[PDB]
Amino acid sequence: QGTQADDLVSAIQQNANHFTELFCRAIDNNMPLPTKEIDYKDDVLDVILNQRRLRNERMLSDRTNEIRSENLMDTPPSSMNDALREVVEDE
Amino acid sequence: AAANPLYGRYNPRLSPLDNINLPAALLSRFDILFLMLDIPSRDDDEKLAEHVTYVHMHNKQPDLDFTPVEPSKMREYIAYAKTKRPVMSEAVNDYVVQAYIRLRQDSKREMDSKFSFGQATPRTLLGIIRLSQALAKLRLADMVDIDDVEEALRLVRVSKESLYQE
Amino acid sequence: SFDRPEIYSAPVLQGESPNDDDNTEIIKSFKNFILEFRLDSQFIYRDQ
Amino acid sequence: PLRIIWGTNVSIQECTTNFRNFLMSFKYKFRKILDEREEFINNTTDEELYYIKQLNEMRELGTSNLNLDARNLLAYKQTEDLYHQLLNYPQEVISIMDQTIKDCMVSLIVDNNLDYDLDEIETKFYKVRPYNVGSCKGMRELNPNDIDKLINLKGLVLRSTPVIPDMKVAFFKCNVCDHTMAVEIDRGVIQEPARCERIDCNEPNSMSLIHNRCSFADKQVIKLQETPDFVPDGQTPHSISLCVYDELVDSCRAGDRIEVTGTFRSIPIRANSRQRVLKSLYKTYVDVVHVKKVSDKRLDVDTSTIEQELMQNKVDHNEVEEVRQITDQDLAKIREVAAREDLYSLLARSIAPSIYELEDVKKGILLQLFGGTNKTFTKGGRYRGDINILLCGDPSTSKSQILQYVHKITPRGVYTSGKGSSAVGLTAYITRDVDTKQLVLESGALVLSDGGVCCIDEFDKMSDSTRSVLHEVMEQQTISIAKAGIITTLNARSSILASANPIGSRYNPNLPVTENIDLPPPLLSRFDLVYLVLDKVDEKNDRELAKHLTNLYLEDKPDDVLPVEFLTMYISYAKEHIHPIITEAAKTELVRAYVGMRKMGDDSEKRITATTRQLESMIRLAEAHAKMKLKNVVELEDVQEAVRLIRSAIKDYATDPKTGKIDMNLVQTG
Numbered sequence: 003q004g005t006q007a008d009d010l011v012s013a014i015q016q017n018a019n020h021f022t023e024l025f026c027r028a029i030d031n032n033m034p035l036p037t038k039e040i041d042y043k044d045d046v047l048d049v050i051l052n053q054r055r056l057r058n059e060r061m062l063s064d065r066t067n068e069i070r071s072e073n074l075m076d077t078p079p080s081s082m083n084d085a086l087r088e089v090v091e092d093e
Numbered sequence: 094a095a096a097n098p099l100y101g102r103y104n105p106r107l108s109p110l111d112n113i114n115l116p117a118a119l120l121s122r123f124d125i126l127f128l129m130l131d132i133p134s135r136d137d138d139e140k141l142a143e144h145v146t147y148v149h150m151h152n153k154q155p156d157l158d159f160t161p162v163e164p165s166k167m168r169e170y171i172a173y174a175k176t177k178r179p180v181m182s183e184a185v186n187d188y189v190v191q192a193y194i195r196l197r198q199d200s201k202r203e204m205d206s207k208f209s210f211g212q213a214t215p216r217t218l219l220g221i222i223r224l225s226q227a228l229a230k231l232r233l234a235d236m237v238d239i240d241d242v243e244e245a246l247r248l249v250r251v252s253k254e255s256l257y258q259e
Numbered sequence: 260s261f262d263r264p265e266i267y268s269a270p271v272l273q274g275e276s277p278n279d280d281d282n283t284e285i286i287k288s289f290k291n292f293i294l295e296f297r298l299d300s301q302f303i304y305r306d307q
Numbered sequence: 308p309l310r311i312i313w314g315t316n317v318s319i320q321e322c323t324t325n326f327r328n329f330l331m332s333f334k335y336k337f338r339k340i341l342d343e344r345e346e347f348i349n350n351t352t353d354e355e356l357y358y359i360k361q362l363n364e365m366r367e368l369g370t371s372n373l374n375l376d377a378r379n380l381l382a383y384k385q386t387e388d389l390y391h392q393l394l395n396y397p398q399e400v401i402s403i404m405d406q407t408i409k410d411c412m413v414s415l416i417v418d419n420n421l422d423y424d425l426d427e428i429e430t431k432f433y434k435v436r437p438y439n440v441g442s443c444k445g446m447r448e449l450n451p452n453d454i455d456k457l458i459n460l461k462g463l464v465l466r467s468t469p470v471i472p473d474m475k476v477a478f479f480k481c482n483v484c485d486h487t488m489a490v491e492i493d494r495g496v497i498q499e500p501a502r503c504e505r506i507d508c509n510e511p512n513s514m515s516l517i518h519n520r521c522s523f524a525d526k527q528v529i530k531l532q533e534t535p536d537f538v539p540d541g542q543t544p545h546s547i548s549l550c551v552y553d554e555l556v557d558s559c560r561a562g563d564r565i566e567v568t569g570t571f572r573s574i575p576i577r578a579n580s581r582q583r584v585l586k587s588l589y590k591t592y593v594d595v596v597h598v599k600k601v602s603d604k605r606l607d608v609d610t611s612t613i614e615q616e617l618m619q620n621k622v623d624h625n626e627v628e629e630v631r632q633i634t635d636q637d638l639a640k641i642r643e644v645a646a647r648e649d650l651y652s653l654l655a656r657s658i659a660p661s662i663y664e665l666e667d668v669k670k671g672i673l674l675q676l677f678g679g680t681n682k683t684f685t686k687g688g689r690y691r692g693d694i695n696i697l698l699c700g701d702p703s704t705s706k707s708q709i710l711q712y713v714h715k716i717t718p719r720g721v722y723t724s725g726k727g728s729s730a731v732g733l734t735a736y737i738t739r740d741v742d743t744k745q746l747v748l749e750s751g752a753l754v755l756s757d758g759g760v761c762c763i764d765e766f767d768k769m770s771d772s773t774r775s776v777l778h779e780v781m782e783q784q785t786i787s788i789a790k791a792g793i794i795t796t797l798n799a800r801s802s803i804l805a806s807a808n809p810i811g812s813r814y815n816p817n818l819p820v821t822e823n824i825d826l827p828p829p830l831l832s833r834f835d836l837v838y839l840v841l842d843k844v845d846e847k848n849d850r851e852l853a854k855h856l857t858n859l860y861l862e863d864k865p866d867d868v869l870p871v872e873f874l875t876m877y878i879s880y881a882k883e884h885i886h887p888i889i890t891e892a893a894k895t896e897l898v899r900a901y902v903g904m905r906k907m908g909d910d911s912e913k914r915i916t917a918t919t920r921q922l923e924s925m926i927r928l929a930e931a932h933a934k935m936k937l938k939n940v941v942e943l944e945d946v947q948e949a950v951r952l953i954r955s956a957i958k959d960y961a962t963d964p965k966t967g968k969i970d971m972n973l974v975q976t977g
């Protein structure tokens with residue numbers, strides 16, 4: 003097509019240890035939602051990771067609710083939602 | 094296994110049991126024993142010499158009438174053949190039983206003679222059954238036919254008797 | 260030629276019941292005082 | 308809403324309710340429907356409440372252990388998830404089951420208004436032992452995601468450590484005011500107090516641990532040689548260290564085949580004793596929950612061997628069964644089959660259905676399995692009714708298959724081969740432990756075979772020095788070792804079942820019997836039965852053998868013969884409950900036959916001479932035959948049958964008394 007793309011193959015051939023984690027992060031960025039519902043026949047690791055993910059979402063929701071309930075400035079909804087997302091994410 | 098006789102060479106003067114250093118039990122454990130005698134003949138030495146010398150010259154098999162099967166191709170075909178589990182019907186069972194009876198009677202008759210190759214054994218019956226099942230596996234079939242048993246018995250006979258008799 | 264192993268935590272359970280003399284509860288009470296104090300009708304400390 | 312234990316999917320309330328409904332609503336007809344056994348369903352057994360009856364009999368006997376089958380949890384519809392929760396999370400779910408069992412014990416006596424007191428139920432700790440949790444996958448096929456999961460292992464016990472006291476409560480005393488207090492353990496960590504608990508005395512570092520005042524618990528480590536059902540390509544068997552606790556300590560002896568179900572653990576191991584630095588690679592072991600020592604496919608262990616062990620099991624309240632329970636209906640069927648006129652031929656024929664003919668060999672194997680009764684002297688001597696059999700003969704006479712069947716059918720036998728075994732490997736040896744780096748004593752094949760049958764293939768190939776060990780085992784059923792580490796006498800009551808070939812690997816009628824067997828007279832005198840199995844070529848015999856051996860290949864999965872389970876329980880009942888004695892009529896026949904063959908041996912080594920050990924073999928074989936027919940006395944018919952079996956094993960009817968030769972065509976019948 004003519005566009006410029008870097009030589010990813012040689013970079014993987016010379017730095018496979020870094021590109022393992024790079025690929026894992028890229029995969030974790032866009033992970034499709036599970037169509038199948040979790041049940042009692044799944045592995046213990048799967049239910050542990052599912053509980054960890056649900057705990058992560060509950061922590062994020064609780065922190066967002068707490069900071070929104072504080073209402074520091076009493077004041078652009080997209081800007082305040084973005085800033086609230088960043089402060090919840092790094093807090 | 095690969096083996097040599099007593100003296101390093103086969104001699105027709107002694108019985109086949111005499112020059113084979115092998116006890117009767119471990120002889121019976123072998124399903125097939127191949128005597129491989131180096132009989133000097135003018136006609137066969139021509140073909141052996143030209144075959145070996147062609148292999149040494151063109152670095153490959155001389156016969157161009159058929160393509161040899163590649164070892165990976167042979168491996169996957171044998172893997173497919175090993176999945177089959179053939180069974181034996183009543184007719185092939187009767188054929189095997191009568192063949193075993195005739196083999197035992199022939200071994201009884203030839204036990205005293207110098208042409209003895211051992212004593213006929215139920216392990217020979219199991220070897221015939223095993224060879225017939227392997228031949229049925231090679232046909233990728235779940236059934237064992239008569240001709241598989243005939244080929245197994247032919248292999249058993251030409252293992253020892255055909256070459257020692259000549 | 261490996262790196263530092265890292266140590267990190269995440270809140271899971273409730274733990275033991277909090278105490279008033281605990282430093283975290285004192286900090287939380289101080290934050291509540293800063294955010295929720297009203298002099299007459301205005302939150303003076305958060306605006307300050 | 309619904310509360311879930313973190314890291315699991317186990318809810319305490321839901322699990323307690325489901326297990327309670329399972330306990331009060333399970334019937335064995337559900338188990339038979341699950342196992343696709345519809346026509347095996349009967350009325351009076353399956354329709355009753357199974358576990359309610361089990362808790363009732365537990366209350367009546369005063370026991371506190373419930374054996375739970377997880378396949379029964381699969382049978383019930385509401386607990387179908389719970390089965391998985393039992394496999395995935397044994398720690399929480401087993402405690403939930405114990406609490407539910409205690410609640411049901413309370414409920415069964417408050418609801419029906421029994422006279423049993425509630426306080427004994429309350430002070431007692433009830434625990435459950437789940438078993439049959441699934442297929443017996445090998446531990447080398449397990450993965451790190453299988454940690455803390457219930458697994459089954461069938462294996463052989465090699466050795467066990469002595470009882471190890473592990474700390475449960477710690478006892479601390481003050482040095483200056485003698486104030487004593489006890490602290491419980493918390494996940495393997497004990498918080499020793501820095502300062503004294505009293506308000507009067509508060510001296511720091513004044514509390515010292517008293518190692519003898521504090522309470523401990525039992526912990527034992529058992530080395531199990533795993534024998535999985537499926538073995539991968541080129542895999543060599545290994546050993547697993549498995550931990551038993553509390554009541555299960557000293558329930559497993561060395562050399563028995565057991566089915567251990569337990570949770571799969573892994574702990575880190577310290578690299579050095581002086582340092583607390585732990586190794587990254589974890590060490591895996593099995594925390595044992597339940598042990599099964601009985602199998603329907605094989606016999607039970609000899610009860611005369613473990614009498615003091617049985618009394619110690621009664622004292623320790625471990626409640627593990629070494630022998631199978633016999634009901635009233637199957638005992639009635641045992642008494643019915645004992646009244647058969649063809650009982651001897653039926654029992655001998657039902658030994659090895661895949662092995663054709665060998666009727667006398669099967670009769671001898673059957674008598675050896677039954678064995679003569681054991682007479683121990685009040686003065687201190689001991690006579691053991693162990694029957695020893697040698698099978699000498701032509702190649703391919705299905706004798707190695709007889710050894711295989713005997714090895715599979717015995718409780719604690721060991722199969723071994725000539726020239727692959729040594730004297731030290733047969734008696735005892737000293738090894739280095741991988742955990743403690745200590746010199747431990749481990750048993751040989753003969754010691755591990757005690758109370759069972761030691762099968763030796765290719766007995767002629769064994770060295771004379773290695774065969775010289777066997778003499779004391781054959782004669783006195785002991786091994787008296789005096790080595791650097793071991794100086795003691797160990798009981799080895801193992802019946803020796805050996806297989807052998809002639810010198811020329813085939814029987815030669817020109818040479819006599821003794822030269823064909825090629826054994827020294829001290830070793831050959833100790834065999835109760837010597838079976839010369841011959842290959843005589845016939846028309847009808849070869850035809851029938853070929854038809855029998857070819858009919859197995861008609862289908863993929865292959866008169867009347869008894870099932871293996873019923874045969875095992877019949878032999879076990881006869882061994883346990885029948886101790887025949889010799890009468891004067893039997894004594895007259897014994898003395899007459901012994902003197903007759905001593906006189907017959909006067910003719911001119913080349914021939915087997917009669918021996919006093921042959922008289923003892925006559926007594927043992929007659930006692931075994933009387934034990935088979937459930938008779939408590941040994942009559943003349945049993946002695947005549949023993950003499951007939953001894954004569955027919957060596958083919959004395961075919962043998963010429965003078966030259967010692969055997970003629971094939973004339974006297975032998977195929």
Ligand SMILES: Nc1ncnc2c1ncn2[C@@H]1O[C@H](COP(=O)(O)OP(=O)(O)OP(O)(O)=S)[C@@H](O)[C@H]1O
Pocket residue numbers: 118119121215216219661662663664701702703704705706707708806807808852856
């Ligand atoms: N009478 C028989 N009944 C049933 N199977 C037999 C009989 N005779 C031989 N066989 C079978 O033939 C094969 C020969 O193996 P084995 O008989 O076990 O060897 P063996 O009897 O120990 O003699 P060796 O090993 O040479 S000392 C096995 O598969 C046996 O099951």
Ligand SMILES: [Mg+2]
Pocket residue numbers: 706707764
């Ligand atoms: Mg053998």
Ligand SMILES: [Zn+2]
Pocket residue numbers: 481482483484485486503504505508509510513
């Ligand atoms: Zn004090």
